[PDB]
Amino acid sequence: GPVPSRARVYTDVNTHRPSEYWDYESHVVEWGNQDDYQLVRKLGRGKYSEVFEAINITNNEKVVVKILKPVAAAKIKREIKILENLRGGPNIITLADIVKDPVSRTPALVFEHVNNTDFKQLYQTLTDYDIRFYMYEILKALDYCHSMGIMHRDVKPHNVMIDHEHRKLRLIDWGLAEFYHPGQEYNVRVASRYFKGPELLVDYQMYDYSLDMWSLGCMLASMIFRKEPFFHGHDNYDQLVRIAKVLGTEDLYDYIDKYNIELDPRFNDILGRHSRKRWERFVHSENQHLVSPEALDFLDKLLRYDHQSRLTAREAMEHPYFYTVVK
Ligand SMILES: Nc1ncnc2c1ncn2[C@@H]1O[C@H](COP(=O)(O)OP(=O)(O)OP(=O)(O)O)[C@@H](O)[C@H]1O
Numbered sequence: 111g112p113v114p115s116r117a118r119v120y121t122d123v124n125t126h127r128p129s130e131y132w133d134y135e136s137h138v139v140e141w142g143n144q145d146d147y148q149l150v151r152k153l154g155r156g157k158y159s160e161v162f163e164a165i166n167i168t169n170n171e172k173v174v175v176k177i178l179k180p181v182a183a184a185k186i187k188r189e190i191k192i193l194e195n196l197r198g199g200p201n202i203i204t205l206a207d208i209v210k211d212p213v214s215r216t217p218a219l220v221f222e223h224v225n226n227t228d229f230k231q232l233y234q235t236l237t238d239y240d241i242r243f244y245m246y247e248i249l250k251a252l253d254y255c256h257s258m259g260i261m262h263r264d265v266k267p268h269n270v271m272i273d274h275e276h277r278k279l280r281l282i283d284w285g286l287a288e289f290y291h292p293g294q295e296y297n298v299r300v301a302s303r304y305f306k307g308p309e310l311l312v313d314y315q316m317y318d319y320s321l322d323m324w325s326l327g328c329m330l331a332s333m334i335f336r337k338e339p340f341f342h343g344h345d346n347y348d349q350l351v352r353i354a355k356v357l358g359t360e361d362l363y364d365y366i367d368k369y370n371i372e373l374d375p376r377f378n379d380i381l382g383r384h385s386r387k388r389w390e391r392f393v394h395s396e397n398q399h400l401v402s403p404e405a406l407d408f409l410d411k412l413l414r415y416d417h418q419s420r421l422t423a424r425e426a427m428e429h430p431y432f433y434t435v436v437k
């Protein structure tokens with residue numbers, strides 16, 4: 111069957127920590143006072159929650175309340191434990207409280223509010239310097255959570271809040287996050303389609319933190335090349351074909367061979383034969399201002415089929431692409 115894999119960094123984190131750290135089922139939730147929060151307006155509704163802007167009436171400060179939809183309780187305790195474990199970490203959203211919603215009778219996660227800049231404005235106007243600056247801020251969040259034995263598994267621009275006025279970034283939406291345990295087989299139905307790593311698309315379950323680094327590369331490619339999304343699959347199968355038209359099919363077959371993966375036969379008629387395209391092929395007059403040899407070298411080291419061959423978040427921080435960023 112498939113050959114096992116383990117991360118090349120932070121494999122022992124959850125072994126060195128006490129069981130209480132990762133055993134989220136055993137965690138006893140400390141419930142706050144639901145009346146401290148007055149809902150102001152609905153901000154959105156996803157598959158797993160309804161999101162509201164609210165006011166903490168004990169300090170008159172804005173908060174965001176995520177009221178969980180009645181779903182599997184195991185997912186809820188996992189997100190709570192991860193948020194508590196990561197609290198105070200660089201650029202990690204702060205979980206301010208956990209209360210029982212009086213209407214839904216389900217948990218409501220209270221977060222610090224970020225006065226976030228409109229997603230479209232960020233995509234359209236962040237400069238070359240700003241992309242490098244904010245990518246460095248995301249790497250601080252990812253190296254932190256990976257160093258804490260957690261993979262985010264849903265890295266994408268809608269999960270990265272920026273209050274541009276205050277040069278403030280927060281990595282949010284930890285609902286798909288998981289503790290990394292070497293040898294564990296994980297569910298491949300994670301991340302948004304355009305950000306799914308090849309490991310997910312080829313149904314390789316023994317993945318790790320490096321999945322986040324692929325997602326980050328997808329985010330970077332779409333920003334610098336002005337191509338939203340960069341890999342535009344019609345479904346999860348066509349998603350792998352879109353990647354193969356850029357990275358080539360030879361390296362894909364080598365990846366499948368190395369990990370002894372049985373590729374879904376549905377791919378035999380759609381993958382075709384493709385050679386890697388040099389990153390310069392995607393440069394044009396409308397994206398030249400965001401492209402540099404350092405950006406292309408960095409992107410090249412994230413977008414690799416072999417999850418063990420990608421830069422880790424800490425190695426990425428050392429890359430020349432960030433030399434210009436004020437530290
Ligand atoms: N801490 C926070 N501060 C401010 N706004 C927040 C915070 N957390 C979440 N939000 C906002 O809550 C809103 C609703 O979130 P939701 O997951 O339902 O939608 P979405 O982000 O637009 O979708 P998706 O990420 O799946 O594409 C979004 O506009 C998001 O920016």
Ligand SMILES: N#CCc1c[nH]c2ccc(C(F)(F)F)cc12
Nearest residue numbers: 232233236241244245267270333
């Ligand atoms: N794509 C897109 C827009 C966007 C939303 N949140 C971000 C966080 C970082 C970056 C960075 F500039 F660093 F790539 C971009 C965004």
